[PDB]
Amino acid sequence: NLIETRCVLNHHSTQETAIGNFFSRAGLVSIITMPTDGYVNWDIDLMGYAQLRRKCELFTYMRFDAEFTFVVAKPNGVLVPQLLQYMYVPPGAPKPTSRDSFAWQTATNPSVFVKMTDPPAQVSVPFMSPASAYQWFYDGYPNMMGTFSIRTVGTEKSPHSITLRVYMRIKHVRAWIPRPLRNQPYLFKTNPNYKGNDIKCTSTSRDKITTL
Amino acid sequence: STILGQLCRYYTQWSGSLEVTFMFAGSFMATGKMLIAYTPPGGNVPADRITAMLGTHVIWDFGLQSSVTLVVPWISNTHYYFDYYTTGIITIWYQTNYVVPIGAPTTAYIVALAAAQDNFTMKLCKDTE
Amino acid sequence: VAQLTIGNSTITTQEAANIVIAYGEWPEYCVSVNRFFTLDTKSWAKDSKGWYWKFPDVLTEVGVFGQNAQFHYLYRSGFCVHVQCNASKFHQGALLVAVLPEYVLGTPYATTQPGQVGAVLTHPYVLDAGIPLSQLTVCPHQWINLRTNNCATIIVPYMNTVPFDSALNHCNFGLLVIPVVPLDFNAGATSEIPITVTIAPMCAEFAGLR
Amino acid sequence: VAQLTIGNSTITTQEAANIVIAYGEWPEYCVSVNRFFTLDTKSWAKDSKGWYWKFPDVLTEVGVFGQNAQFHYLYRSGFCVHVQCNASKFHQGALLVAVLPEYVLGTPYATTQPGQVGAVLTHPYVLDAGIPLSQLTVCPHQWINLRTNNCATIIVPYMNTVPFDSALNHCNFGLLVIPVVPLDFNAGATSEIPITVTIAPMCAEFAGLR
């Protein structure tokens, strides 16, 4: 319901629509459970959610950094003094295949060791592509950034269920070549396919052209 | 049927360049496009539009210009009944179809004019047949 | 009415000083390759939907540009596209001519890269990619309106993340021609209107070492 | 659009600077004789073949030029001929307007020198003289093409082997108008297109002592 009064006359500053301010906020990108294997693998994926896929696909070539933060607790709030290990596998190194494989002790996969009772750990990741910028649209026939691996430290099964959440901020953003915004529902995470049996119009509908 | 083809019956050898001028004689309201392709001597006739485009060609739209010229670079002849003759082939290709509004006629006509250039010479006068 | 002359190929067009430059940049560096290639003519009918050509897939089987791309590995060039239409003053309609970098289609090799003939869109409201037609004018575009003008020229520079790339796998941009306002006429006129595309490469380099 | 004014006769024509001068020479020397005489109009039909007028036989029964030639013995003048056509933008055709000095016909006095009306060719492919039509453009000629232009003017000087000659026996040149490309139209338009000839003598002298 629209109403009449309270009009504004003073113009606003143009810093509110800078390209850095459009992606400045940090949001949840994944949720990783681990019930009572013992290891998980979550590769870095931006288009895991329908939100922020529609916002990055406004442009074509983007170049940025990242900043991750791992909030970790039990399935219901509480904390216990448990030691953890977050291993970051760069693009081009083999992933751990077991709870006690050789890749957990490789000297070139950097890790962090935190307890559950600490403030959450914060890691920054630089621009990793061999090209000059990422691209969400590749026309030819054949954007990986890495893979996080998380396990509980020990040679013995821990009697605790762990659920952690991953947050991600984006810094020093540059963009190129804008593009129309997608107005159709998604099907997969790789290709821009739509459902051809029905096409949802962009606008809503009204009865006649004269009834405003 | 030209005047150049009748004066070259009085001689034996000639060489030089020519030029061919076309002229559209249709209604004012119609338009279209033609492709004037010229094959160099010793080559083959083009089989379709796409191979003729790669050679030497002009693009003639008779909606703007009603006439166009094409220059043959070099011809030669040494007569002996057989003659040593090095010339090409000129072909006309429908680029687009003929588009015409309501009331104008459907068919048109092209007239082809021909003349020699500055550097056209001949020698060895010979009485004709 | 002027008459251009590049190489051994001459066209006759109006010297029209209303060209568009894609993003304000001229094609710059990092014998018979600079001429005027002319594709086939597509016939605009009353129920046509649209056409597209992928670059530089359209020029891989044509001329010396077709054989240079099939031998050298690396490749880099700009372009200059010229689209014109030929209709009398009794027809009506409008076309939208816009380029689109990294055009990815949506549901074979005979459809994504059709070659020199081009292909036909099936759902032109969503461009066969899920993005709506009504916001296409954020790209470099030009309006062809049969009431006034019959010409459209775009200058497209090289847009890629690497300074050199292959010419048989990647396709940089696809050019789109969509009839927004349909063609209409009375009976007794020409039912099919031709559309003619003309390409000319600018600042082409090959360093593939063949 | 200008309006000429010579004597007591004014015509309205376009000031067209594409005249032809026969052999590059202006009429020079060795009251009411310099004006604009306008002959009758010939109707171009779908099956017409051609027309011709012999000079100066056409102006021996018209005006003060007609009575001056019938009294004086000697005679010498140049000419200036203006041929124009009036058709709309839905007709098509082409005319060839060329002069021909010492035009001798081939098989009576009512055909070789017809007078002011003119005559009609019977075999226009051979000009009724055995010479082919296709080489007529070696003479001073001008193309009338109904697509573009509707005017043709030739300046003809005096061409004879003697400096003065009679005006009732000799005829210097005959002007020819031949429809190379025939007239075509759809039904419901004007079936007959008019052709109008206009003569104006330049540098006329009479020394016949009457």
Coordinates of N, CA, C and O in Angstrom, one line a residue, chain D residues 19-170:
Chain D
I19 N 25.4 19.7 -69.2 CA 25.2 19.8 -70.7 C 26.3 19.2 -71.4 O 27.4 18.9 -70.9
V20 N 26.1 18.8 -72.7 CA 27.1 18.3 -73.5 C 27.3 19.2 -74.7 O 26.3 19.8 -75.2
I21 N 28.5 19.4 -75.0 CA 28.9 20.3 -76.2 C 29.4 19.3 -77.3 O 30.3 18.6 -77.0
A22 N 28.8 19.4 -78.4 CA 29.2 18.6 -79.6 C 30.6 19.0 -80.0 O 30.8 20.1 -80.5
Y23 N 31.6 18.1 -79.8 CA 33.0 18.2 -80.2 C 33.7 19.4 -79.6 O 34.7 19.9 -80.2
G24 N 33.2 19.9 -78.5 CA 33.9 20.9 -77.7 C 34.0 22.3 -78.3 O 34.9 23.1 -77.8
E25 N 33.2 22.7 -79.2 CA 33.2 24.0 -79.9 C 31.9 24.7 -79.7 O 30.8 24.2 -79.8
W26 N 32.0 26.0 -79.3 CA 30.8 26.8 -79.2 C 30.4 27.5 -80.5 O 31.2 27.8 -81.3
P27 N 29.1 27.7 -80.7 CA 28.6 28.3 -82.0 C 29.1 29.8 -82.0 O 28.7 30.6 -81.1
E28 N 29.8 30.2 -83.1 CA 30.3 31.5 -83.2 C 30.0 32.0 -84.6 O 29.5 31.2 -85.5
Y29 N 30.2 33.3 -84.8 CA 30.0 33.9 -86.1 C 31.1 33.5 -87.1 O 32.2 33.1 -86.7
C30 N 30.8 33.6 -88.4 CA 31.8 33.3 -89.4 C 32.9 34.3 -89.5 O 32.9 35.4 -89.0
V31 N 16.6 39.7 -83.9 CA 15.7 40.3 -82.9 C 14.8 39.3 -82.3 O 14.8 39.1 -81.1
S32 N 14.0 38.7 -83.1 CA 13.1 37.7 -82.7 C 13.3 36.3 -83.3 O 12.4 35.5 -83.4
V33 N 14.6 36.1 -83.7 CA 15.0 34.8 -84.2 C 15.6 33.9 -83.1 O 15.6 32.7 -83.2
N34 N 16.0 34.6 -82.0 CA 16.5 33.9 -80.8 C 15.4 33.8 -79.8 O 15.2 34.8 -79.0
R35 N 14.7 32.7 -79.8 CA 13.7 32.4 -78.7 C 13.6 30.9 -78.5 O 14.5 30.2 -78.9
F36 N 12.5 30.5 -77.9 CA 12.4 29.1 -77.6 C 11.2 28.5 -78.3 O 10.0 28.7 -77.9
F37 N 11.5 27.9 -79.4 CA 10.4 27.2 -80.2 C 10.2 25.8 -79.5 O 11.1 25.1 -79.1
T38 N 8.9 25.4 -79.4 CA 8.5 24.2 -78.7 C 7.7 23.4 -79.7 O 6.6 23.8 -80.1
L39 N 8.2 22.2 -80.1 CA 7.5 21.4 -81.0 C 6.3 20.6 -80.3 O 6.0 20.8 -79.2
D40 N 5.7 19.8 -81.1 CA 4.6 19.0 -80.5 C 5.1 17.9 -79.6 O 6.3 17.6 -79.7
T41 N 4.2 17.3 -78.9 CA 4.6 16.3 -77.9 C 4.2 14.9 -78.5 O 3.1 14.7 -79.0
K42 N 5.2 14.0 -78.5 CA 5.0 12.6 -78.9 C 4.7 11.7 -77.7 O 5.4 11.9 -76.7
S43 N 3.8 10.8 -77.9 CA 3.3 10.0 -76.8 C 4.0 8.7 -76.8 O 3.8 7.9 -77.7
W44 N 4.8 8.4 -75.8 CA 5.5 7.2 -75.6 C 4.6 6.1 -75.2 O 4.0 6.2 -74.1
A45 N 4.4 5.1 -76.0 CA 3.5 4.0 -75.6 C 4.3 2.7 -75.4 O 5.6 2.8 -75.4
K46 N 3.7 1.6 -75.2 CA 4.4 0.4 -74.8 C 5.1 -0.2 -76.0 O 6.0 -1.0 -75.9
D47 N 4.6 0.1 -77.3 CA 5.2 -0.5 -78.5 C 5.8 0.5 -79.4 O 5.9 0.2 -80.6
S48 N 6.1 1.7 -78.9 CA 6.7 2.7 -79.8 C 8.1 2.3 -80.1 O 8.8 1.5 -79.4
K49 N 8.6 2.8 -81.3 CA 9.9 2.4 -81.8 C 10.9 3.5 -81.9 O 12.1 3.2 -81.6
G50 N 10.5 4.7 -82.2 CA 11.5 5.8 -82.2 C 10.9 6.9 -83.1 O 10.0 6.8 -83.8
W51 N 11.6 8.1 -82.9 CA 11.2 9.3 -83.6 C 12.5 10.0 -84.1 O 13.5 9.9 -83.5
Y52 N 12.3 10.8 -85.2 CA 13.4 11.6 -85.6 C 12.9 12.9 -86.3 O 11.8 12.9 -86.8
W53 N 13.7 13.9 -86.2 CA 13.5 15.2 -86.8 C 14.7 15.7 -87.5 O 15.8 15.6 -87.0
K54 N 14.5 16.2 -88.8 CA 15.6 16.6 -89.6 C 15.8 18.1 -89.4 O 14.8 18.9 -89.5
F55 N 17.0 18.6 -89.2 CA 17.3 20.0 -89.1 C 18.0 20.5 -90.3 O 18.8 19.9 -91.0
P56 N 17.7 21.8 -90.7 CA 16.7 22.7 -90.2 C 15.4 22.6 -90.9 O 14.7 23.6 -91.1
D57 N 15.0 21.4 -91.4 CA 13.7 21.2 -92.1 C 12.6 21.4 -91.1 O 11.5 21.7 -91.6
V58 N 12.8 21.2 -89.8 CA 11.7 21.3 -88.9 C 11.2 22.7 -88.6 O 10.1 22.9 -88.2
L59 N 12.1 23.7 -88.9 CA 11.8 25.1 -88.7 C 11.6 25.9 -89.9 O 12.0 27.1 -90.0
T60 N 11.0 25.3 -91.0 CA 10.8 26.1 -92.2 C 9.4 26.6 -92.4 O 9.2 27.3 -93.3
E61 N 8.5 26.1 -91.5 CA 7.1 26.6 -91.6 C 6.6 27.2 -90.3 O 5.4 27.4 -90.1
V62 N 7.6 27.6 -89.4 CA 7.3 28.0 -88.1 C 7.9 29.4 -87.9 O 9.2 29.5 -87.9
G63 N 7.1 30.4 -87.7 CA 7.6 31.7 -87.2 C 8.4 32.5 -88.2 O 8.3 32.3 -89.4
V64 N 9.2 33.4 -87.7 CA 10.0 34.3 -88.5 C 11.2 33.5 -89.0 O 11.8 33.9 -90.1
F65 N 11.6 32.4 -88.4 CA 12.6 31.6 -89.0 C 12.1 30.8 -90.2 O 12.9 30.5 -91.1
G66 N 10.8 30.6 -90.2 CA 10.2 29.9 -91.4 C 10.2 30.7 -92.6 O 10.4 30.3 -93.7
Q67 N 9.9 32.0 -92.4 CA 9.8 32.9 -93.6 C 11.1 33.5 -94.0 O 11.3 33.9 -95.1
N68 N 12.1 33.6 -93.1 CA 13.4 34.1 -93.4 C 14.2 33.0 -94.3 O 14.9 33.4 -95.2
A69 N 13.9 31.7 -94.0 CA 14.6 30.7 -94.8 C 14.0 30.6 -96.2 O 14.7 30.2 -97.1
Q70 N 12.7 30.9 -96.3 CA 12.0 30.8 -97.6 C 12.3 32.0 -98.5 O 11.8 32.0 -99.7
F71 N 13.0 33.0 -98.1 CA 13.3 34.2 -98.9 C 14.8 34.3 -99.2 O 15.2 34.5 -100.3
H72 N 15.6 34.2 -98.1 CA 17.0 34.3 -98.3 C 17.6 33.1 -99.0 O 17.0 32.0 -98.9
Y73 N 18.7 33.2 -99.7 CA 19.3 32.0 -100.4 C 20.2 31.3 -99.4 O 20.1 30.1 -99.1
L74 N 21.2 32.0 -98.8 CA 22.2 31.4 -97.9 C 21.7 31.4 -96.5 O 20.8 32.1 -96.1
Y75 N 22.4 30.6 -95.7 CA 21.9 30.3 -94.4 C 23.0 29.6 -93.6 O 23.7 28.8 -94.1
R76 N 23.1 30.0 -92.3 CA 24.1 29.4 -91.4 C 23.7 29.7 -90.0 O 23.5 30.8 -89.6
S77 N 23.7 28.6 -89.1 CA 23.4 28.8 -87.7 C 23.8 27.6 -86.9 O 24.0 26.5 -87.5
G78 N 24.0 27.8 -85.6 CA 24.1 26.7 -84.7 C 22.7 26.4 -84.1 O 21.7 27.0 -84.5
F79 N 22.7 25.5 -83.1 CA 21.4 25.2 -82.4 C 21.7 24.9 -80.9 O 22.8 24.9 -80.5
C80 N 20.6 24.6 -80.2 CA 20.6 24.2 -78.8 C 19.3 23.5 -78.6 O 18.2 24.1 -78.6
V81 N 19.4 22.2 -78.4 CA 18.2 21.3 -78.3 C 18.0 20.9 -76.8 O 19.0 20.6 -76.1
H82 N 16.8 20.9 -76.4 CA 16.4 20.5 -75.1 C 15.2 19.5 -75.1 O 14.2 19.8 -75.6
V83 N 15.5 18.3 -74.6 CA 14.5 17.2 -74.6 C 14.3 16.8 -73.2 O 15.2 16.6 -72.4
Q84 N 13.0 16.8 -72.8 CA 12.6 16.4 -71.4 C 11.4 15.5 -71.4 O 10.6 15.6 -72.3
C85 N 11.3 14.7 -70.4 CA 10.2 13.8 -70.2 C 9.5 14.0 -68.9 O 10.1 14.4 -67.9
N86 N 8.2 13.6 -68.8 CA 7.4 13.8 -67.6 C 6.8 12.5 -67.2 O 5.7 12.1 -67.8
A87 N 7.3 11.8 -66.2 CA 6.7 10.5 -65.7 C 6.9 10.5 -64.2 O 7.8 11.0 -63.7
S88 N 6.0 9.8 -63.6 CA 6.0 9.6 -62.2 C 7.0 8.6 -61.7 O 7.7 8.0 -62.6
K89 N 7.1 8.3 -60.4 CA 8.1 7.4 -59.9 C 7.6 6.0 -59.8 O 8.2 5.2 -59.1
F90 N 6.7 5.6 -60.6 CA 6.2 4.3 -60.7 C 6.4 3.7 -62.1 O 6.1 2.5 -62.4
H91 N 6.9 4.5 -63.1 CA 7.2 4.0 -64.4 C 8.7 3.8 -64.6 O 9.5 4.3 -63.8
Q92 N 9.0 3.0 -65.6 CA 10.4 2.7 -65.8 C 10.7 2.6 -67.3 O 9.8 2.3 -68.1
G93 N 11.9 3.0 -67.7 CA 12.3 3.0 -69.1 C 13.5 3.9 -69.2 O 14.0 4.5 -68.3
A94 N 14.0 3.9 -70.5 CA 15.2 4.6 -70.8 C 15.2 5.0 -72.2 O 14.8 4.3 -73.1
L95 N 15.7 6.3 -72.5 CA 15.8 6.8 -73.9 C 17.2 7.1 -74.2 O 18.0 7.4 -73.3
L96 N 17.5 7.1 -75.5 CA 18.8 7.5 -76.0 C 18.6 8.7 -77.0 O 17.9 8.6 -77.9
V97 N 19.2 9.8 -76.6 CA 19.0 11.0 -77.4 C 20.4 11.4 -78.0 O 21.3 11.8 -77.3
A98 N 20.5 11.3 -79.3 CA 21.8 11.5 -80.0 C 21.5 12.2 -81.3 O 20.5 11.9 -82.0
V99 N 22.5 13.0 -81.7 CA 22.4 13.7 -83.0 C 23.3 12.9 -84.0 O 24.1 12.0 -83.6
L100 N 23.1 13.1 -85.3 CA 23.8 12.4 -86.3 C 23.9 13.3 -87.5 O 23.0 13.5 -88.2
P101 N 25.1 13.8 -87.8 CA 25.3 14.6 -89.0 C 25.2 13.9 -90.3 O 25.8 12.8 -90.4
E102 N 24.5 14.5 -91.3 CA 24.3 14.0 -92.6 C 23.6 12.6 -92.5 O 24.1 11.6 -93.0
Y103 N 22.4 12.6 -91.9 CA 21.7 11.3 -91.7 C 21.0 11.0 -93.0 O 20.1 11.7 -93.5
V104 N 21.4 9.9 -93.7 CA 20.8 9.5 -94.9 C 20.0 8.2 -94.7 O 20.5 7.3 -94.1
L105 N 18.7 8.3 -95.1 CA 17.8 7.1 -94.8 C 17.9 6.1 -95.9 O 18.8 6.2 -96.8
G106 N 17.1 5.1 -95.8 CA 17.1 4.0 -96.8 C 15.7 3.4 -96.9 O 14.9 3.4 -95.9
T107 N 15.4 2.8 -98.0 CA 14.1 2.2 -98.2 C 14.1 0.7 -97.8 O 14.6 -0.2 -98.4
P108 N 10.2 8.6 -100.6 CA 9.4 9.7 -100.9 C 9.8 11.0 -100.2 O 10.6 10.9 -99.2
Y109 N 9.3 12.1 -100.6 CA 9.6 13.4 -99.9 C 8.9 13.5 -98.6 O 9.4 14.3 -97.7
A110 N 7.8 12.8 -98.3 CA 7.1 12.9 -97.1 C 7.7 12.0 -96.0 O 7.1 11.8 -94.9
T111 N 8.9 11.4 -96.2 CA 9.5 10.5 -95.3 C 10.9 11.0 -94.9 O 11.4 11.0 -93.8
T112 N 11.7 11.4 -96.0 CA 13.0 11.9 -95.7 C 13.0 13.3 -95.0 O 13.8 13.5 -94.1
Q113 N 12.1 14.2 -95.4 CA 12.0 15.5 -94.8 C 10.5 15.6 -94.4 O 9.7 16.1 -95.1
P114 N 10.2 15.2 -93.2 CA 8.7 15.1 -92.8 C 8.2 16.5 -92.3 O 7.0 16.7 -92.3
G115 N 9.1 17.4 -91.8 CA 8.6 18.7 -91.4 C 8.7 18.9 -89.9 O 9.7 18.5 -89.3
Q116 N 7.6 19.4 -89.3 CA 7.6 19.8 -87.9 C 7.1 18.7 -87.0 O 7.4 18.6 -85.9
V117 N 6.3 17.7 -87.6 CA 5.7 16.7 -86.8 C 6.7 15.6 -86.4 O 6.8 15.1 -85.3
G118 N 7.6 15.3 -87.4 CA 8.5 14.2 -87.3 C 8.0 12.9 -87.8 O 6.8 12.8 -88.2
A119 N 8.8 11.9 -87.8 CA 8.4 10.6 -88.4 C 8.7 9.5 -87.4 O 9.3 9.7 -86.3
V120 N 8.4 8.2 -87.7 CA 8.6 7.1 -86.8 C 9.5 6.1 -87.6 O 9.3 5.8 -88.7
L121 N 10.5 5.6 -86.9 CA 11.3 4.5 -87.4 C 10.6 3.2 -87.6 O 9.7 2.9 -86.8
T122 N 10.9 2.5 -88.6 CA 10.3 1.2 -88.8 C 11.2 0.0 -88.4 O 10.6 -0.9 -87.8
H123 N 12.5 0.1 -88.6 CA 13.4 -0.9 -88.1 C 14.4 -0.2 -87.2 O 15.5 0.3 -87.7
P124 N 14.2 0.0 -85.9 CA 15.1 0.7 -85.0 C 16.3 0.0 -84.7 O 17.2 0.7 -84.1
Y125 N 16.5 -1.2 -85.0 CA 17.7 -1.9 -84.7 C 18.8 -1.5 -85.6 O 20.0 -1.5 -85.2
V126 N 18.5 -1.1 -86.8 CA 19.5 -0.7 -87.8 C 19.3 0.7 -88.2 O 19.9 1.1 -89.2
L127 N 18.5 1.5 -87.5 CA 18.3 2.9 -87.7 C 17.7 3.3 -89.0 O 17.8 4.5 -89.4
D128 N 17.1 2.3 -89.7 CA 16.7 2.5 -91.1 C 17.8 3.0 -92.1 O 17.5 3.6 -93.1
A129 N 19.0 2.6 -91.8 CA 20.2 3.0 -92.6 C 21.2 2.0 -92.7 O 22.3 2.2 -93.3
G130 N 21.0 0.8 -92.1 CA 22.0 -0.3 -92.2 C 23.1 -0.2 -91.1 O 23.8 -1.2 -91.0
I131 N 23.2 0.8 -90.3 CA 24.2 0.9 -89.3 C 23.5 0.5 -88.0 O 22.4 0.8 -87.7
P132 N 24.3 -0.2 -87.1 CA 23.6 -0.8 -85.9 C 23.4 0.3 -84.8 O 24.1 1.3 -84.8
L133 N 22.4 0.0 -84.0 CA 22.0 0.9 -82.9 C 23.1 1.0 -81.8 O 23.3 2.0 -81.2
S134 N 23.8 -0.2 -81.6 CA 24.6 -0.3 -80.4 C 25.9 0.5 -80.5 O 26.5 0.7 -79.4
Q135 N 26.3 1.1 -81.6 CA 27.4 1.9 -81.7 C 27.0 3.4 -81.9 O 27.8 4.2 -82.4
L136 N 25.8 3.8 -81.5 CA 25.4 5.1 -81.7 C 26.0 6.1 -80.8 O 26.0 7.3 -81.1
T137 N 26.6 5.7 -79.7 CA 27.2 6.5 -78.7 C 28.5 7.1 -79.1 O 29.1 7.8 -78.2
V138 N 29.0 6.9 -80.3 CA 30.2 7.6 -80.7 C 29.8 9.1 -81.2 O 30.7 9.9 -81.3
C139 N 28.5 9.3 -81.4 CA 28.0 10.6 -81.6 C 27.8 11.4 -80.3 O 27.9 10.8 -79.3
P140 N 27.6 12.7 -80.4 CA 27.1 13.4 -79.2 C 25.8 12.9 -78.7 O 24.8 13.0 -79.4
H141 N 25.8 12.3 -77.5 CA 24.6 11.6 -77.0 C 24.3 12.0 -75.6 O 25.2 12.6 -74.9
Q142 N 23.2 11.6 -75.1 CA 22.8 11.8 -73.7 C 21.7 10.8 -73.3 O 20.8 10.6 -74.1
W143 N 21.9 10.2 -72.1 CA 21.0 9.2 -71.7 C 19.9 9.8 -70.8 O 20.2 10.5 -69.8
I144 N 18.6 9.5 -71.2 CA 17.5 9.9 -70.4 C 17.0 8.6 -69.7 O 16.5 7.7 -70.3
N145 N 17.2 8.6 -68.4 CA 16.8 7.4 -67.6 C 15.7 7.9 -66.6 O 15.9 8.7 -65.7
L146 N 14.5 7.3 -66.7 CA 13.3 7.7 -65.9 C 13.5 7.5 -64.4 O 12.7 8.0 -63.7
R147 N 14.5 6.7 -64.0 CA 14.7 6.5 -62.6 C 15.3 7.8 -62.0 O 14.8 8.2 -60.9
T148 N 16.2 8.4 -62.6 CA 16.9 9.5 -62.0 C 16.6 10.9 -62.6 O 16.1 11.8 -61.9
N149 N 16.8 11.1 -63.9 CA 16.8 12.4 -64.5 C 15.8 12.5 -65.6 O 15.4 11.5 -66.3
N150 N 15.3 13.7 -65.8 CA 14.2 14.0 -66.8 C 14.6 15.1 -67.7 O 13.8 15.9 -68.1
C151 N 15.9 15.2 -68.1 CA 16.3 16.3 -68.9 C 17.6 16.0 -69.7 O 18.4 15.1 -69.2
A152 N 17.7 16.5 -70.9 CA 18.9 16.3 -71.7 C 19.0 17.5 -72.7 O 18.1 17.9 -73.4
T153 N 20.2 18.1 -72.7 CA 20.5 19.3 -73.5 C 21.8 19.1 -74.3 O 22.8 18.7 -73.7
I154 N 21.7 19.3 -75.6 CA 22.9 19.2 -76.4 C 23.1 20.6 -77.1 O 22.2 21.2 -77.5
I155 N 24.4 21.0 -77.2 CA 24.8 22.2 -78.0 C 25.4 21.8 -79.3 O 26.5 21.1 -79.2
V156 N 24.8 22.1 -80.4 CA 25.3 21.6 -81.7 C 25.8 22.8 -82.5 O 25.1 23.7 -82.8
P157 N 27.1 22.8 -82.9 CA 27.6 23.9 -83.8 C 27.3 23.7 -85.2 O 26.6 22.7 -85.6
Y158 N 27.8 24.5 -86.1 CA 27.6 24.4 -87.5 C 28.6 23.5 -88.2 O 29.8 23.8 -88.1
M159 N 28.2 22.4 -88.8 CA 29.1 21.4 -89.4 C 28.7 21.3 -90.9 O 27.8 20.6 -91.2
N160 N 29.6 21.8 -91.7 CA 29.4 21.7 -93.2 C 30.7 22.0 -93.8 O 31.7 22.5 -93.2
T161 N 30.8 21.5 -95.1 CA 32.1 21.7 -95.9 C 32.2 23.0 -96.5 O 33.3 23.4 -97.0
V162 N 31.1 23.8 -96.6 CA 31.1 25.1 -97.2 C 30.6 26.1 -96.1 O 29.8 25.7 -95.2
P163 N 31.0 27.3 -96.1 CA 30.6 28.2 -95.0 C 29.2 28.7 -95.0 O 28.7 29.1 -94.0
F164 N 28.5 28.6 -96.2 CA 27.1 28.9 -96.3 C 26.4 27.9 -97.2 O 27.0 27.4 -98.1
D165 N 25.1 27.7 -96.9 CA 24.4 26.7 -97.7 C 22.9 27.1 -97.8 O 22.5 27.9 -97.0
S166 N 22.2 26.4 -98.7 CA 20.8 26.6 -98.8 C 20.1 26.0 -97.7 O 20.6 25.2 -96.9
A167 N 18.8 26.4 -97.5 CA 18.0 26.0 -96.4 C 16.7 25.2 -96.8 O 16.0 24.8 -95.9
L168 N 16.5 25.0 -98.1 CA 15.4 24.3 -98.6 C 15.7 22.9 -99.2 O 14.8 22.1 -99.4
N169 N 17.0 22.6 -99.4 CA 17.4 21.4 -100.0 C 18.2 20.6 -99.0 O 17.9 19.4 -98.8
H170 N 19.3 21.1 -98.5 CA 20.2 20.4 -97.6 C 19.6 20.3 -96.2 O 18.8 21.2 -95.8

